[PDB]
Design a protein around this ligand. Structure first.
Ligand SMILES: *[C@@H]1O[C@H](CO)[C@@H](O[C@@H]2O[C@H](CO)[C@@H](O[C@@H]3O[C@H](CO)[C@@H](O)[C@H](O)[C@@H]3O)[C@H](O)[C@H]2NC(C)=O)[C@H](O)[C@H]1NC(C)=O
Ligand SMILES: *[C@@H]1O[C@H](CO)[C@@H](O[C@@H]2O[C@H](CO)[C@@H](O[C@@H]3O[C@H](CO)[C@@H](O)[C@H](O)[C@@H]3O)[C@H](O)[C@H]2NC(C)=O)[C@H](O)[C@H]1NC(C)=O
Ligand SMILES: *[C@@H]1O[C@H](CO)[C@@H](O[C@@H]2O[C@H](CO)[C@@H](O[C@@H]3O[C@H](CO)[C@@H](O)[C@H](O)[C@@H]3O)[C@H](O)[C@H]2NC(C)=O)[C@H](O)[C@H]1NC(C)=O
Ligand SMILES: *[C@@H]1O[C@H](CO)[C@@H](O[C@@H]2O[C@H](CO)[C@@H](O[C@@H]3O[C@H](CO)[C@@H](O)[C@H](O)[C@@H]3O)[C@H](O)[C@H]2NC(C)=O)[C@H](O)[C@H]1NC(C)=O
Ligand SMILES: *[C@@H]1O[C@H](CO)[C@@H](O[C@@H]2O[C@H](CO)[C@@H](O[C@@H]3O[C@H](CO)[C@@H](O)[C@H](O)[C@@H]3O)[C@H](O)[C@H]2NC(C)=O)[C@H](O)[C@H]1NC(C)=O
Lengths: 346, 346, 346, 346, 346
């Protein structure tokens, strides 16, 4: 017999009329390319740019009847990646690329094998920086849906149709963890067929659901925003005579709370709508600012203090501290129930 | 019959005299290239660099009478993108590129089809980082106009003329949203014909209007700049005896206001002129600094306090707190009306 | 005799049937490629991205019986790196590349020599940015294990098998130091054989253990977090009459401690779990917040002060300062023993 | 007649002996290349890196007598940019490149036309990141001089001489504005002929003067550094009895002034010399620190207060507040005159 | 005669047997390549990455007896940089590259001339980002030694030997200044011959000494760390009765000093050892913290005050303020002498 690279030069050379610019089944039914991906790495999900970097193995399988040998005795013929300019390949691209590249270290990372009946496996390694629009209406408790979609570019729907295969169309690597998110195991697979004025082009896509990990935000920006509210409660257990204390406590807490509010959106996109970390800060702004306005009611009623009625005006000024010691730590707990039930329903 | 790639080698080969370095209609009328773009992605509109990243499909259509076949029975002949060095193509470029690249993942993202009469469609995918000069005179309420312009580089006006087509010269993708801006639906299309000492070169351009979303700035830098003004009002409801309080309230507010003023321009270009976020901070600097100077009038008139006249000097010192409780929250509201009417007219 | 480049064109030319697309020992036993690396540079171990940049010399040795000359008198024949497209080479790649490149300054940095029996040495220079998942459960005292793994891409296990050689499979450069870490001298070498639906592909890997240097974190974020706890102790040595002092000391310390807590995770990945620098800050939050609640017990018992019993209520209010001067600096030392024994066992 | 690309293959082919490796007028007088640039974009003038990004059209004109046709009837023959490897071109480079690239979007952005007598116009588009050493001795009021210089690399002075042309050697685009600087209209043009041990190489250069816009620094770092000085003046209008006030005012101002001093050099190169923004901060450090030392003279003379002499010692302690209310706002204005006259002369 | 490019095709063509893959003096003595560099630009010496960017002209001279013409009448023959693949060139590389690139703007920046006896000058332009390990034990007063080393990659010591030439082996450009450092004029030149298991490879290197400019650190982080120590001295000149003052002065200074300590290492590598800017901050931490503990001794001895003995206990409490006004500004000056003599000896 003869070696396969000399045998594949007979299948692809000047003889046999194989022309690599012409799709299989020409002037016939369209080419049914079936696809599946294998996610090696995932992550660096930025939100300022609203993008995420994935690192996939893109496998494509089609049928090319001109490559159907019957004399060489094997069942699969590998190609050198140097000879990948010699067969037809589908012009797949990603409709939200935002920059992508191959991997060409120590060899082009490309695989190509040809079965006997003409089935062609073609596996390459791609690094993508895909774009997904973030929806941050409920921000530490959101379930993002970042997608990726695989169109054709030169061939219309009556020449080339993409399909996901039925045998596990999206595999994920074995120990693929993410720092901030978790990747849910149910991955949607649906069509996204595009219509332009050039024609109608095929498109398949895969949705990935990325549920967050709330445990980070629960440590940096919910509990230190809950202690400073309790500092504003301890002004109530000091008498109406340490005026440099209860004012100075109602100033340093309400102005370290503004730093918490501005520091809550340090690395976020400047979205117009109000998000679920903003109706925690702008309500805990309100509790630490109502503790300062409580003392400004005490020291104003007390300075208004005729003997008999003003002894009750001092007693009116102590009756308001027998209420705000109980009202504020049991209205803030009513809000703390209406908040966490709202975002564990929506 | 014969397959089209063998047929197009007859239209472009050594026979028939087709020379890819020579424009259509040579020594004749100029080539009327008509253009339209399709914006896939838009955004990352930085203002430190004053640029924005767009991701377009650039379609070009011209007429090439040497490619007018009449024997092959179809109506459109696709090319392989490998054979794009074999026809004439217009040397379009972007006059404010600032860096740009093609997309070459799994295939060169290029499309080329040739009709029977010689009409050539040519669609490529480009990522641009275009430069637009920002005008930030009224900064959270501005309507930017960031443009893009498509010149020729080697052919003058008497050889190649660009036109926008009449059938929707700028399409935008279906769900294209922006984080900070909104893209207005009216897009200007006008000529920008350049004159150099080399010649006069054709140019068409498209204006994009990018109205901001004020809802972000309304949460971070208008309301926390409006609470700290109200902290400087609560010094008035404390008597002229808590000297560590009303001074300490007129210091911490007026120096957390400087942090608001410096934090207002954290990620902005260092422009020379004064912008609409600066005449909100440098007026709310003035209200929280006039509350400190109000107490320095109280505690100086009171320390000046002969029995009969100085009892009115204490009463003069309380008459000024029966005025500044009403004057300052009803002069700040007069400014708050003159401000928001001014920037919802201009 | 004749020069070696004319001699190697006899070994690789049109004569002798050497085909560079066909592995050695075709239709036979697999090719035993043996590998070892030489780490020139190491480091820039980022944790936001969870990656590290290495700069290696990748040596590969296999056996190619078609290159076994016997007439030329030397024992080793170098190649020009221009003629590296003319022999077979293993298609090694790194299964966690995340971007990598060759070095091509003044010459392609590639080495290739061929012995007499057919042994082929092949040494190239690669810069890698490898991905390793960080485990930060005990963060300033952790021993990371960042790995690198060398698969095949086109050849399955029955065609190409990777091995580490027995003579020092991972060398490290002479004075290779790291800024933050130290590289332990025991390096694990184990197999990582992959199974896909394409086939089973060979894989070898090398574990690197990266023990940190605790001496940085001991200066920035343990001792300044230990002085501010001692500032909250000095409130106890001031009487229950300087109410602007002991409150103002129990506010500035407990709110500069929040800046220490937020500044503790300035450049860290937003992990969900709680790490060993967080149960030092959120316990030293508790000591500086219990010094403020100690005074709120003193000034509330003292303001509650009938002649005989209230003289003991003042004495009850001084008995609590004869306890908290000794309890708090000898409970914080009990925690300071339970902490550092826990993370010098785990 | 025949088309020009077939005509230029007669001027440059195997016939006529045109060799693209050999300069015009060989073994004769040097080639007089004349140059002029056209600045499309300018800016991103960083000072940490001390570089600036320019985007030019580099036009070069020389004379090549071997390209002097006389039979083809036109007056100018364009080239395809694909055929730019076929004539001689000057090996110009930029002696302070620091990285540069061409622009190759939709076509190589290169222009080449050949007149009848042999004059060759050659216009390319380059993006440069040029290096200019910043001189920051007087920092918000400095006039930078950032240059660019165009040497030869392989040909010495007796083979190739660069010249600026007399007809406007540096053009600037129509609406080219800069965010921080303004580009003065007088641009110096002078020679920079280099001497190495290889030979003497030609060099021309163009100076650009970049006067700043002081209006940004006048809003962020001169007026907020002028209000905090006036806060330190308002300690004088409070009596010598509010010891928590005048000390607390002489501490918060003098320590928010240190943040102004460190925030003054947030994004500057760490230069050794003292600059004009540093002798404004380190003098306004001195005024807000002399207001604290003024009170430490008052409360120390007052606590030193025998009946008759100490009544004047209280009166000595009020005589010092009848001086520092007028001395400090009329010594700070003497400095404010010596400062702004000094940097509007130098 | 005939032009040199036709003459050099006779020296390098199919005739004369010149093979560009075979070094000069084959099967003979090694090739003595002599080198010297010319530093155009230097700097951007980062310390987070521990690297520095240099921009050199690398000149190499060797002897190639096959290029020794004797008939053409000149003394030097330039090459086109297009014909640099036609002679032998040494495979030099930089053993600490960390990324490097050529410069290819308007022409490949390469020079090549061949003398009559066969001497070959070869000058290229390279941008390097070289790695140097920083030693920061004495950080604002350190003399770094950042090196660069030039190995061979494919040829061992018995085939190719690098040498520095005796006539000024490292030139520096005329006005090369650095922002933070100064480049000392004595540059060490020494051998660095490497031994691997492949062989022994030649290596030469050049040390550069980079003495810092202390004048920046003397303005930002020594004098503002020296004023805050003097603020902690002014607590001594206020009596033991303004308890909100001397405590509030011993809190704001000792907690703005922690910001100085954390801000001292904002842009530094996280090294384990203690550096000379850290034993200035952590000693000026100690002086501003001993001023707070001095008042906690005063107000505790005074509150301990039977008539006769306690009048001396008040006098004991004023005797400690007649000592700490002189002890602390004359112990801090003893440290300020032991510090600056220590780092101007080491
Ligand atoms: C690629 O896959 C497509 C399906 O997505 C195939 O298209 C379909 O092919 C059938 C022939 O097998 C076409 O004919 C139909 O046959 C059924 C009987 O099986 C008959 O009941 C129908 O009336 C019709 O005649 C069918 O129209 C066609 N559908 C479309 C939408 O094109 C295609 O054949 C596959 N091509 C290859 C090369 O595998
Ligand atoms: C490309 O489009 C341009 C228009 O932008 C065409 O130029 C114009 O072509 C006409 C011929 O159709 C020229 O002749 C004019 O004809 C009218 C009658 O239709 C006559 O009234 C005028 O006096 C004149 O003779 C016209 O001068 C020309 N205009 C310009 C500015 O060049 C051009 O023909 C188009 N080329 C192709 C190949 O489609
Ligand atoms: C590459 O290395 C592999 C080992 O990883 C070699 O595979 C082994 O080769 C032996 C022949 O030397 C095969 O035959 C065995 O021989 C022993 C006697 O030595 C006999 O007791 C066994 O029953 C068996 O017949 C062995 O099966 C094979 N093992 C595997 C897993 O393939 C291989 O030969 C090496 N190839 C080259 C080109 O060096
Ligand atoms: C390129 O430009 C240079 C000038 O920068 C030209 O060099 C000068 O050329 C003249 C000939 O025209 C040389 O001869 C001189 O002629 C004058 C009379 O015109 C005579 O009085 C002098 O004594 C001398 O003979 C002159 O030496 C030469 N100068 C230099 C510095 O080389 C050059 O000819 C131009 N080349 C081309 C191809 O245009
Ligand atoms: C390149 O430079 C090396 C030196 O680094 C040259 O190597 C030395 O060459 C001499 C011949 O000139 C060798 O022979 C010695 O000659 C002296 C008399 O001059 C004699 O006393 C010694 O006993 C010895 O025979 C010498 O061994 C050799 N040294 C080494 C280390 O190789 C080399 O010749 C130069 N090559 C070229 C092409 O310039």
């Amino acid at each position: 017999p003869m070696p396969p690279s000399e045998f594949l030069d007979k299948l692809m050379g000047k003889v046999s009329g194989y022309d690599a610019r012409i799709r299989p089944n020409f002037k016939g039914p369209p080419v049914n390319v079936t696809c599946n991906i294998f996610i090696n790495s995932f992550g660096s999900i930025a939100e300022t740019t609203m993008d995420y970097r994935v690192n996939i193995f893109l496998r494509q399988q089609w049928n090319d009847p001109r490559l159907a040998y019957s004399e060489y005795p094997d069942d699969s013929l590998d190609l050198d990646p140097s000879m990948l300019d010699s067969i037809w390949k589908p012009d797949l691209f990603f409709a939200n690329e935002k920059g992508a590249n191959f991997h060409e270290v120590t060899t082009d990372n490309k695989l190509l094998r040809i079965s006997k009946n003409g089935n062609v496996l073609y596996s390459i390694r791609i690094t993508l920086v895909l774009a997904c629009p973030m929806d941050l209406k409920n921000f530490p408790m959101d379930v993002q849906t970042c997608i990726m979609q695989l169109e054709s570019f030169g061939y219309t729907m009556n020449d080339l149709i993409f399909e996901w295969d039925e045998k596990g169309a999206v595999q994920v690597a074995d120990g693929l963890t993410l720092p901030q998110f978790i990747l849910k195991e149910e991955k949607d697979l649906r069509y996204c067929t595009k219509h332009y004025n050039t024609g109608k082009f095929t498109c398949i896509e895969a949705r990935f659901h990325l549920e967050r990990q709330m445990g980070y935000y629960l440590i940096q920006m919910y509990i230190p925003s809950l202690l400073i509210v309790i500092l504003s409660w301890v002004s109530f257990w000091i008498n109406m005579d340490a005026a440099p204390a209860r004012v100075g406590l109602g100033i340093t807490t309400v102005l370290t709370m503004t730093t918490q509010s501005s520091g809550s959106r340090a690395s976020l996109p400047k979205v117009s709508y109000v998000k679920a970390i903003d109706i925690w800060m702008a309500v805990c702004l309100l509790f630490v600012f109502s503790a300062l306005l409580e003392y400004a009611a005490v020291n104003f009623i007390a300075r208004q203090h005729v003997e008999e009625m003003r002894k009750l005006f001092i007693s009116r000024a102590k009756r308001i501290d027998t209420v705000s010691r109980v009202a504020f730590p049991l209205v803030f707990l009513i809000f703390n129930i209406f908040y966490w039930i709202t975002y564990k329903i929506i």
